[PDB]
């Protein structure tokens, strides 16, 4: 079993305003156990876009079924895209930790551009 890797294969995704953007992400292992989260931006001012664990995110749909024990696909879809959604989106693996989950590894990021 190699070490966990978070793979975002797309440098860029172009979406028309109003359409649905797909952000691809794959984890190459399930060790360690822990949730995947999506952010726009890096650093402390990161916007939480999706969280596998908890929370309500009405614009976001996962491509795959995450409740599958064997799942490694963490791609998401964001509906009703407006120009305010442009930015760089990061797929980040967390590990359970003590009290709260802590960042483990991050994908390289995907830039989202609107109106083609």
């Amino acid at each position: 079993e190699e070490e966990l890797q978070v793979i975002q294969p797309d440098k860029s995704v172009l979406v028309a305003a109003g359409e649905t953007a797909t952000l691809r992400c794959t984890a190459t292992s399930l060790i360690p156990v822990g949730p995947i989260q999506w952010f726009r931006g890096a650093g402390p001012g990161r916007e939480l876009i999706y969280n596998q664990k908890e929370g309500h995110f009405p614009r976001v749909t996962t491509v795959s079924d995450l409740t599958k024990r064997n799942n490694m696909d963490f791609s998401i879809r964001i509906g009703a895209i407006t120009p305010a959604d442009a930015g760089t989106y990061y797929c980040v693996k967390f590990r359970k930790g003590s009290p709260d989950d802590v960042e483990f590894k991050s994908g390289a990021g995907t830039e989202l551009s609107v109106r083609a």
Partner: antibody
Framework: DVQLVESGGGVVRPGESLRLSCAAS????????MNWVRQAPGEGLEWVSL????????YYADSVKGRFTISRDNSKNTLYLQMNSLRAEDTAVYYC????????????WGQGTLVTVSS | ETVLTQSPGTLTLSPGERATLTCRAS??????LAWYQEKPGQAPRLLIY???SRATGIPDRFSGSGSGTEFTLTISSLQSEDFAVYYC??????????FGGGTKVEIKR
């Protein structure tokens, strides 16, 4: 091999305009993101702008935002930088750089061309 | 943005010595750090990508290491053509793409 030939640099006055060209050869120009990077005399490397292979994804550095316009012409295998309302701080050697397929680092560079903004 | 700081600005070493150049990021960039070489008067050229991957055609004495916020470019034995300026560049946090300030390797005598 991969080649990037730049041109258009020169001496201009503040507020005037210039146009830089980066003619490519030895690779499929249409499928690579291209960047402009500058280096003021005695200073370090500074990212200026980037344009996707398709030409529709475009970012600028804040210090040039609204004055410079990047574009490409895949039919002529040349990248352009349109510099308008130039300031003294724009004096630099300007390099064109070809990005890696997946990541935003620069695989190949042009020879550079010099822009002097002076009165 | 993410700020990269290279220290020191000038590194003074004798030919054939080991050079160890540092690059520190103000916040984590994981493994998404490149190193460029700039010999006097020439355009920059890529040496290292992905913190540790040697670019095609780059001599073996160049090696990169580190992750997160601390990176190191090592030259095992300095040749004459290695006295130049070296820049690190991160591509995790973008835009903007950001460069370090540069370290110049000068000949000791």
């Amino acid at each position: 091999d991969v080649q990037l030939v730049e041109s258009g640099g020169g001496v201009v006055r503040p507020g005037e305009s210039l146009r830089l060209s980066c003619a490519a050869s030895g690779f499929t120009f249409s499928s690579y993101d291209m960047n402009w990077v500058r280096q003021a005399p005695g200073e370090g490397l500074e990212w200026v702008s980037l344009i996707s292979g398709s030409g529709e994804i475009i970012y600028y550095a804040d210090s040039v935002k609204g004055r410079f316009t990047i574009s490409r012409d895949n039919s002529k295998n040349t990248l352009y930088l349109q510099m308008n309302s130039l300031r003294a701080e724009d004096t630099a050697v300007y390099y064109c750089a070809k990005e890696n397929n997946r990541y935003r680092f620069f695989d190949d560079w042009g020879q550079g061309t010099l822009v002097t903004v002076s009165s | 943005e993410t700020v990269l700081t290279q220290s020191p600005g000038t590194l003074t070493l004798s030919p054939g010595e080991r050079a160890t150049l540092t690059c520190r990021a103000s916040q984590s960039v994981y493994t998404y750090l490149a190193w460029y070489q700039e010999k006097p008067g020439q355009a920059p050229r890529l040496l290292i990508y992905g913190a540790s991957s040697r670019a095609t055609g780059i001599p073996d004495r160049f090696s990169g290491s580190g992750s997160g916020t601390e990176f190191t470019l090592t030259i095992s034995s300095l040749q004459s053509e290695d006295f130049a300026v070296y820049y690190c560049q991160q591509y995790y946090d973008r835009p903007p793409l950001t460069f370090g300030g540069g370290t110049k390797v000068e000949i000791k005598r």
